[PDB]
């Protein structure tokens, strides 16, 4: 079975993130799943930034670039770069990300109210979030 999730959509999108911020790599790295959820993708990925990571640690489109005539989900991570963070709130990153993977339990329509309001919950618009708190009331009432 060919199961590549909306998970690793998260992964392919989070890697849209400024690769300046590689502890961002790190971080993603090891509050995933090592285990299980290693993708061929995130094999790549983990082991060419590891190997920057061990000396000089940036990683550029030039990678994936010279990658042009293998592992072309490069091309789809260099279409990732291609595609702005600039259309994009920052909370396509972060909020989606946790949320596209989280929503992989037992959350159903409601239990994502919950999630959607612990995310933000860092310190968002959440007078906004309040009202949006009471739907996440309704989840909480689900029980």
Same mark, same amino acid.
């Not at 090891?30 to 190997?51: A, G, I, M, P």
């Given at each position: 079975?060919?199961?590549? &999730?909306?998970?690793?959509?998260?992964?392919?999108?989070?890697?849209?993130?400024?690769?300046?911020?590689?502890?961002?790599?790190?971080?993603?790295?090891?509050?995933?799943?090592?285990?299980?959820?290693?993708?061929?993708?995130?094999?790549?990925?983990?082991?060419?930034?590891?190997?920057?990571?061990?000396?000089?640690?940036?990683?550029?489109?030039?990678?994936?670039?010279?990658?042009?005539? &293998? $592992?072309?989900?490069?091309?789809?991570?260099? &279409?990732?770069?291609?595609? $702005?963070?600039?259309?994009?709130?920052?909370?396509?990153?972060?909020?989606?990300?946790? $949320?596209?993977?989280?929503?992989?339990?037992?959350?159903?329509?409601?239990?994502? $109210?919950?999630?959607?309001?612990?995310?933000?919950?860092?310190?968002?618009?959440?007078?906004?979030?309040?009202?949006?708190?009471?739907?996440?009331?309704?989840?909480?009432?689900?029980?």
């Amino acid at each position: 079975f060919d199961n590549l &999730s909306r998970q690793e959509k998260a992964e392919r999108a989070f890697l849209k993130h400024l690769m300046r911020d590689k502890d961002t790599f790190l971080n993603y790295y090891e509050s995933v799943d090592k285990d299980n959820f290693t993708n061929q993708h995130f094999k790549y990925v983990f082991e060419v930034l590891h190997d920057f990571y061990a000396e000089n640690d940036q990683y550029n489109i030039s990678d994936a670039v010279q990658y042009v005539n &293998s $592992n072309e989900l490069r091309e789809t991570l260099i &279409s990732l770069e291609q595609y $702005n963070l600039n259309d994009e709130p920052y909370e396509n990153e972060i909020d989606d990300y946790v $949320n596209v993977i989280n929503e992989k339990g037992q959350e159903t329509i409601e239990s994502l $109210n919950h999630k959607l309001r612990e995310a933000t919950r860092i310190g968002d618009v959440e007078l906004q979030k309040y009202y949006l708190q009471q739907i996440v009331a309704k989840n909480k009432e689900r029980m």
